[PDB]
Amino acid sequence: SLEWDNLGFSLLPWIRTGLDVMGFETMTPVQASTIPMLAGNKDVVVDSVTGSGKTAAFVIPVLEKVVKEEANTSKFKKAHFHSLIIAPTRELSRQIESVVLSFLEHYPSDLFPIKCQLLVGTNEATVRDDVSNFLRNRPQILIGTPGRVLDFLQMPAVKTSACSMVVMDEADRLLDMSFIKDTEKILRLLPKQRRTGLF
RNA sequence: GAUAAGGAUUGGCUCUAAGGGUCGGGUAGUGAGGGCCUUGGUCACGGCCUUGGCUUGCUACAAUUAACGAUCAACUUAGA
């Protein structure tokens, strides 16, 4: 059908509003076959052509899971996060973060906010600045490259126990021989019982 | 001992945390401060009150590959 209205789990009104303002005029086959399952207690391994709605395909289920598990509430603890997103290059992670910000533009007020933080290797911010504003702003989404997110997670001030969603974009590149050393540690730190999406 | 070698001309892959600290960018206009001047009254070369002409601030165009440069501080042969 490729219609947003007739999907299995009736996407949230603000996510639907963001989709309509952005458009796409419909949902692509990737987003039609991945969103129902990645939010439905199934890990996902997705192969698709470039520019086929993959980024939204793994961003919408992330927000759905964040809202579903009561991550956007006062009950959520400090120095904890919900979802992690990993990409092999800094520009790709920044672009993913921009997409997430665009989706969160239409997030309603009068509720506990949902935020994201980008963790890339930069000369404008040490890892301790990242820890400081992570503690202050309390986001639920982390997006970054393997090196800086590994350094961030290794800091004792950050607790990974509440994470329930890991996404690896360009997962063939992140499981490459060069990247496997860092990603093995990154996944070693995080809890095993989780939902994984490789794209 | 990592990093392709170890008498030779050593410089050696892509992406991915950090790689000692610090400082520094133009040309123009007008306000400010200092410096040399100078002009009157005033008190025995020196004060007092007044008159007209290197640092920094605000605006207007180039540069944003400063992806450069400067300075301070560290360091020596793992071979038997």
Short mmCIF file of C-alpha atoms (C1' of nucleotides) in Angstrom, two decimals:
data_model
loop_
_atom_site.label_atom_id
_atom_site.label_comp_id
_atom_site.label_asym_id
_atom_site.label_seq_id
_atom_site.Cartn_x
_atom_site.Cartn_y
_atom_site.Cartn_z
CA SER A 1 0.00 0.00 0.00
CA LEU A 2 2.83 2.39 0.96
CA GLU A 3 0.51 4.62 3.00
CA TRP A 4 1.46 5.96 6.43
CA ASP A 5 -2.10 5.65 7.76
CA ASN A 6 -2.39 1.88 7.24
CA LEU A 7 0.78 0.81 9.05
CA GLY A 8 0.66 -1.75 11.83
CA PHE A 9 1.31 0.35 14.92
CA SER A 10 -0.20 3.80 14.18
CA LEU A 11 2.82 6.13 14.32
CA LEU A 12 2.80 8.98 16.84
CA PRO A 13 0.96 12.18 15.82
CA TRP A 14 4.03 14.42 16.05
CA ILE A 15 6.16 11.98 14.04
CA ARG A 16 3.36 11.91 11.46
CA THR A 17 3.25 15.72 11.44
CA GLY A 18 7.01 15.91 10.92
CA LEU A 19 6.77 13.38 8.09
CA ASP A 20 3.97 15.33 6.42
CA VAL A 21 5.83 18.64 6.66
CA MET A 22 8.97 16.99 5.28
CA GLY A 23 6.80 15.09 2.82
CA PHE A 24 8.18 12.09 0.88
CA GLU A 25 4.56 11.80 -0.39
CA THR A 26 4.55 8.16 0.80
CA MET A 27 6.69 5.58 2.62
CA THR A 28 9.42 3.77 0.70
CA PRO A 29 9.63 -0.05 0.67
CA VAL A 30 12.59 0.12 3.08
CA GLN A 31 10.62 2.26 5.52
CA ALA A 32 7.55 0.08 4.92
CA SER A 33 9.36 -3.17 5.77
CA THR A 34 11.78 -1.97 8.48
CA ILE A 35 9.78 0.38 10.73
CA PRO A 36 7.10 -2.21 11.69
CA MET A 37 9.75 -4.74 12.77
CA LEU A 38 12.54 -2.61 14.25
CA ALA A 39 9.96 -1.30 16.74
CA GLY A 40 8.47 -4.76 17.24
CA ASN A 41 11.05 -6.78 19.19
CA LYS A 42 13.13 -7.75 16.15
CA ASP A 43 16.69 -6.90 15.24
CA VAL A 44 17.11 -5.63 11.70
CA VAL A 45 19.69 -6.22 8.96
CA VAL A 46 18.88 -3.93 6.02
CA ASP A 47 20.51 -3.77 2.60
CA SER A 48 19.16 -1.02 0.36
CA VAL A 49 20.26 1.34 -2.39
CA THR A 50 21.60 4.80 -1.61
CA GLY A 51 19.02 7.50 -0.95
CA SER A 52 16.03 5.18 -0.41
CA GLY A 53 14.79 6.63 2.87
CA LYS A 54 17.09 4.49 5.02
CA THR A 55 17.98 7.27 7.48
CA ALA A 56 14.35 7.97 8.32
CA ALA A 57 13.81 4.20 8.29
CA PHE A 58 16.07 3.85 11.33
CA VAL A 59 15.28 7.25 12.89
CA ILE A 60 11.49 6.86 13.21
CA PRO A 61 11.70 3.53 15.13
CA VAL A 62 14.32 5.09 17.42
CA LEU A 63 11.93 7.87 18.44
CA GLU A 64 9.06 5.38 18.72
CA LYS A 65 11.09 3.19 21.09
CA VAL A 66 12.22 6.24 23.07
CA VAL A 67 8.63 7.32 23.67
CA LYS A 68 7.44 3.74 24.23
CA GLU A 69 9.93 2.89 27.00
CA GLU A 70 9.12 6.12 28.90
CA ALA A 71 12.52 7.62 28.15
CA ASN A 72 11.05 11.14 27.81
CA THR A 73 9.90 11.40 31.43
CA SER A 74 11.07 12.62 34.82
CA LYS A 75 11.55 8.98 35.88
CA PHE A 76 14.54 8.72 33.51
CA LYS A 77 17.84 8.83 35.35
CA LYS A 78 20.84 11.13 34.97
CA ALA A 79 24.05 10.15 33.15
CA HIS A 80 22.01 7.55 31.24
CA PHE A 81 21.05 7.32 27.58
CA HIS A 82 18.56 5.30 25.56
CA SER A 83 19.69 4.92 21.95
CA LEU A 84 23.07 4.97 20.21
CA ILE A 85 23.85 5.54 16.52
CA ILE A 86 27.27 4.83 14.99
CA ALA A 87 28.65 5.83 11.57
CA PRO A 88 32.16 5.38 10.16
CA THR A 89 32.80 9.05 9.32
CA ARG A 90 32.18 12.35 11.08
CA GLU A 91 30.16 13.96 8.27
CA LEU A 92 27.79 11.00 8.06
CA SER A 93 27.12 11.14 11.81
CA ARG A 94 26.57 14.90 11.67
CA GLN A 95 24.12 14.40 8.78
CA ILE A 96 22.26 11.74 10.77
CA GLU A 97 22.09 14.16 13.69
CA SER A 98 20.72 16.87 11.39
CA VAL A 99 18.00 14.47 10.21
CA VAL A 100 17.10 13.65 13.83
CA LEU A 101 16.96 17.36 14.67
CA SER A 102 14.70 17.97 11.67
CA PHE A 103 12.35 15.25 12.91
CA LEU A 104 12.41 16.67 16.46
CA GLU A 105 11.61 20.18 15.18
CA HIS A 106 7.90 19.40 15.43
CA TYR A 107 8.19 17.75 18.84
CA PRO A 108 5.40 19.21 21.02
CA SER A 109 6.10 21.41 24.02
CA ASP A 110 4.60 21.03 27.53
CA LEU A 111 6.38 17.67 27.91
CA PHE A 112 9.80 16.43 28.95
CA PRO A 113 12.00 17.13 25.92
CA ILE A 114 13.83 14.58 23.77
CA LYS A 115 17.35 15.64 22.76
CA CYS A 116 20.34 14.27 20.87
CA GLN A 117 24.09 14.68 21.24
CA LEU A 118 26.79 14.31 18.58
CA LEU A 119 30.11 12.77 19.70
CA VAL A 120 32.76 13.22 17.00
CA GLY A 121 36.46 13.91 17.18
CA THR A 122 36.81 17.68 17.05
CA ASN A 123 39.40 20.27 18.00
CA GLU A 124 36.68 22.58 19.37
CA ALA A 125 35.49 20.33 22.22
CA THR A 126 37.35 17.86 24.41
CA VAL A 127 35.70 14.71 25.71
CA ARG A 128 35.24 16.41 29.09
CA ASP A 129 33.11 19.14 27.50
CA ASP A 130 31.04 16.34 25.95
CA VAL A 131 30.61 14.76 29.39
CA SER A 132 29.73 18.11 30.97
CA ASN A 133 26.98 19.01 28.51
CA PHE A 134 25.76 15.40 28.46
CA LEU A 135 25.23 15.67 32.22
CA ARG A 136 23.67 19.13 31.98
CA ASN A 137 21.34 18.62 29.00
CA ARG A 138 20.45 14.94 29.61
CA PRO A 139 19.79 13.66 26.07
CA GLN A 140 18.36 10.28 25.15
CA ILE A 141 19.99 9.90 21.71
CA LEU A 142 23.73 9.65 21.06
CA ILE A 143 25.14 9.88 17.52
CA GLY A 144 28.81 9.61 16.71
CA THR A 145 31.89 7.95 15.28
CA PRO A 146 33.42 4.89 16.97
CA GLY A 147 36.51 6.61 18.40
CA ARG A 148 34.91 9.52 20.23
CA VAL A 149 31.91 7.48 21.39
CA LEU A 150 34.32 4.85 22.73
CA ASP A 151 36.23 7.55 24.60
CA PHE A 152 32.93 8.99 25.86
CA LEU A 153 31.59 5.64 27.09
CA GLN A 154 34.89 4.81 28.80
CA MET A 155 34.52 7.85 31.06
CA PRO A 156 33.21 6.77 34.49
CA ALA A 157 30.65 9.61 34.56
CA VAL A 158 28.53 7.94 31.85
CA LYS A 159 26.34 4.93 32.65
CA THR A 160 25.22 2.67 29.80
CA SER A 161 22.82 0.43 31.73
CA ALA A 162 19.59 1.97 30.39
CA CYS A 163 20.46 1.69 26.69
CA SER A 164 17.95 -0.36 24.71
CA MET A 165 18.62 0.50 21.05
CA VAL A 166 21.80 0.41 18.95
CA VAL A 167 21.95 1.41 15.28
CA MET A 168 24.98 0.98 13.02
CA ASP A 169 24.82 2.79 9.69
CA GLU A 170 27.17 1.49 7.00
CA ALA A 171 27.40 -1.63 9.15
CA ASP A 172 29.58 -3.40 6.59
CA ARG A 173 32.20 -0.67 7.04
CA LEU A 174 31.96 -0.67 10.85
CA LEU A 175 32.48 -4.45 10.97
CA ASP A 176 35.49 -4.11 8.66
CA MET A 177 38.84 -5.39 9.88
CA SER A 178 39.97 -1.89 10.86
CA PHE A 179 36.78 -0.87 12.70
CA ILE A 180 36.06 -4.21 14.36
CA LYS A 181 38.51 -3.51 17.20
CA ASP A 182 36.67 -0.34 18.27
CA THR A 183 33.12 -1.58 17.66
CA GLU A 184 33.80 -4.75 19.65
CA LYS A 185 34.71 -2.61 22.67
CA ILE A 186 31.75 -0.26 22.11
CA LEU A 187 29.32 -3.19 22.06
CA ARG A 188 31.18 -4.79 24.97
CA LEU A 189 30.40 -1.78 27.17
CA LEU A 190 26.69 -1.71 26.26
CA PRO A 191 24.12 -4.22 27.57
CA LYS A 192 23.54 -7.37 25.54
CA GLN A 193 19.73 -7.40 25.80
CA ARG A 194 18.87 -4.71 23.27
CA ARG A 195 17.56 -4.12 19.75
CA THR A 196 20.15 -3.76 17.00
CA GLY A 197 19.71 -2.26 13.56
CA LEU A 198 22.42 -2.71 10.95
CA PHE A 199 21.95 -0.64 7.78
"C1'" G B 1 60.36 -4.02 20.27
"C1'" A B 2 54.28 -2.79 16.75
"C1'" U B 3 53.55 -0.22 12.21
"C1'" A B 4 57.29 -2.04 4.52
"C1'" A B 5 62.84 -2.31 5.00
"C1'" G B 6 67.30 -1.54 8.09
"C1'" G B 7 73.92 0.85 4.56
"C1'" A B 8 70.90 3.93 2.40
"C1'" U B 9 68.16 9.21 -1.27
"C1'" U B 10 63.46 7.14 4.67
"C1'" G B 11 59.66 10.08 3.28
"C1'" G B 12 55.32 4.74 3.94
"C1'" C B 13 47.81 3.46 3.07
"C1'" U B 14 41.92 4.84 3.96
"C1'" C B 15 38.45 5.90 7.97
"C1'" U B 16 38.43 6.21 13.20
"C1'" A B 17 39.11 9.24 20.80
"C1'" A B 18 43.78 12.54 22.50
"C1'" G B 19 48.90 13.65 20.37
"C1'" G B 20 52.44 19.51 25.80
"C1'" G B 21 50.80 24.91 26.81
"C1'" U B 22 49.92 29.70 24.83
"C1'" C B 23 49.59 33.80 21.39
"C1'" G B 24 48.86 36.14 16.75
"C1'" G B 25 45.31 38.44 10.67
"C1'" G B 26 44.55 43.54 6.50
"C1'" U B 27 42.89 48.84 4.30
"C1'" A B 28 40.00 53.18 5.25
"C1'" G B 29 36.95 57.19 8.35
"C1'" U B 30 35.94 59.14 13.09
"C1'" G B 31 36.11 59.16 18.67
"C1'" A B 32 39.71 58.37 23.24
"C1'" G B 33 44.52 58.18 25.71
"C1'" G B 34 50.08 59.45 25.58
"C1'" G B 35 54.37 62.39 23.24
"C1'" C B 36 56.68 66.86 21.11
"C1'" C B 37 54.50 72.16 20.64
"C1'" U B 38 52.59 76.74 21.36
"C1'" U B 39 49.55 80.71 23.40
"C1'" G B 40 47.35 84.05 27.95
"C1'" G B 41 46.51 85.13 33.28
"C1'" U B 42 48.55 83.77 37.72
"C1'" C B 43 52.04 82.74 42.05
"C1'" A B 44 59.45 83.02 43.55
"C1'" C B 45 64.32 77.70 35.43
"C1'" G B 46 59.36 75.64 38.76
"C1'" G B 47 53.84 75.31 39.92
"C1'" C B 48 48.48 76.69 39.39
"C1'" C B 49 43.77 77.62 35.70
"C1'" U B 50 43.05 78.00 30.33
"C1'" U B 51 43.85 78.20 24.35
"C1'" G B 52 44.77 75.53 18.62
"C1'" G B 53 48.17 69.62 15.72
"C1'" C B 54 52.95 55.12 20.00
"C1'" U B 55 48.46 52.25 22.65
"C1'" U B 56 43.22 51.68 22.03
"C1'" G B 57 37.73 52.02 20.92
"C1'" C B 58 33.40 52.27 17.19
"C1'" U B 59 31.82 51.85 11.88
"C1'" A B 60 32.82 50.67 5.99
"C1'" C B 61 35.35 47.02 1.98
"C1'" A B 62 38.97 42.63 1.20
"C1'" A B 63 40.80 37.54 3.93
"C1'" U B 64 38.25 33.37 5.93
"C1'" U B 65 43.02 26.62 2.73
"C1'" A B 66 45.22 30.77 10.33
"C1'" A B 67 45.10 23.72 6.22
"C1'" C B 68 49.80 29.63 8.35
"C1'" G B 69 53.25 31.62 11.62
"C1'" A B 70 55.51 32.96 16.53
"C1'" U B 71 56.96 31.85 21.50
"C1'" C B 72 57.47 28.94 26.21
"C1'" A B 73 58.32 24.21 28.14
"C1'" A B 74 59.79 18.89 27.66
"C1'" C B 75 63.25 14.60 25.27
"C1'" U B 76 67.53 10.95 24.20
"C1'" U B 77 70.77 4.50 21.14
"C1'" A B 78 66.88 -2.08 24.44
"C1'" G B 79 69.69 -4.65 23.57
"C1'" A B 80 72.10 -9.22 25.91
#
